Design a protein around this nucleic acid. Structure first.
Length: 73
RNA sequence: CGUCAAAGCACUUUGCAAAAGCUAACGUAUCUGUUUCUUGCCUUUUACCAGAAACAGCCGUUUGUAAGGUGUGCUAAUUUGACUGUAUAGUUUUUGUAAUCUUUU
C-alpha cells in the first residue's frame, strides 16, 4: 500500500529524525515544520560528522538543495 | 494588451509643392476645344457626320509640407512610432555536485 513523500513527512513531524547532506554530514533532531519543498527545520540538533558529535547548535533550518537523506531514530 | 520615444489632440481654412521610378483604374466617373489627316451630308463660311494621330483645356482625386481657424486639454488627453515583451527555487541554461587536498613540469 503506497506511502508518498508528502504524507511521509507529514507523519514524520515531531519524532526523532536523522538526515544527511551531500557532503557527508548527518544531523539528528526532532522536526517542527515541512514546506512544499521539503526544506527541513530542526530543534535541539547535534551534528554527527563521520559518526562523531562536533557541536550542539539547537534551532536549525537546512536549505533543501543539500539534503541527501531523510529517515528515522 | 504591455513597455520606451516623440508629439498637445481631434475637427477644420488657405498657401506652396509634388502624383507610371518594375504594365497600370491619380477618376471602377467622363466632356469641350485646337492642329494634321482621312471619309460623310453639302455649296455660303460658320454650325455639323464619325474614325485616326499630336497636342490642349475643364469638372474632380491623393499625398507631403507651412501657416492658421473651432472644440478641448497645456496640475492632462490623444495620436504616432519603436521594441531581443511574460514570472519557472523540484531533471536540458538564472537559487549551484559544490567544497577541499596532493603530486608532476
Amino acid at each position: 500500500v503506497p506511502v508518498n513523500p508528502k504524507p511521509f513527512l507529514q507523519g514524520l513531524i515531531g519524532k526523532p529524525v536523522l538526515v544527511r547532506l551531500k557532503w557527508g554530514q548527518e544531523y539528528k533532531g526532532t522536526l517542527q515544520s515541512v514546506d512544499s519543498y521539503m526544506n527541513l527545520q530542526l530543534l535541539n540538533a547535534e551534528e554527527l560528522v563521520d559518526g562523531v558529535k562536533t557541536g550542539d547548535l539547537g534551532e536549525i533550518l537546512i536549505r533543501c538543495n543539500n539534503v541527501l537523506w531523510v529517515g528515522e531514530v
